[PDB]
């Protein structure tokens, strides 16, 4: 198992390398608000975004009804 040196680097094939920390969106439930261009009405939606798995979205559309999208279907 490659091991980190005291300097925070990995010696891979004698070459000194570094692994950079990656900025990513955290999994969770995210609520959003947008404007319906067709009516200028205010619409709300929410996405449940996991680390692995299908997506689950809910939204209130311009005709005032609540709907769900499962697995982007």
């Amino acid at each position: 198992f490659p091991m980190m040196t005291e300097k925070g680097t990995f010696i891979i094939n004698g070459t000194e390398r570094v692994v950079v920390s990656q900025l990513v969106r955290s999994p969770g439930v995210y609520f959003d608000e947008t404007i319906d261009k067709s009516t200028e009405k205010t619409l709300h939606s929410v996405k449940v975004i996991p680390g692995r798995g299908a997506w689950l979205e809910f939204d209130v559309d311009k005709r005032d009804t609540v709907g769900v999208r499962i697995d982007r279907k």
Partner: protein
């Protein structure tokens, strides 16, 4: 609902104005639908709204 001569129409329009100010966030983009028996009555509403 009230007998004639009680000014129910103006009271209702005042109620509508109060509702549309209080909840303007939830209604201003949707508007109001005013239904009347005759075009002349709707002109009256347009005058007193």
């Amino acid at each position: 609902e009230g007998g004639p001569g009680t000014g129910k129409t103006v009271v209702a329009l005042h109620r509508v104005a109060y509702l549309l100010y209080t909840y303007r966030k939830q209604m201003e983009r949707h508007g109001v639908l005013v239904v009347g028996p005759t075009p002349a009555f709707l002109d009256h509403i347009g005058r007193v709204l």
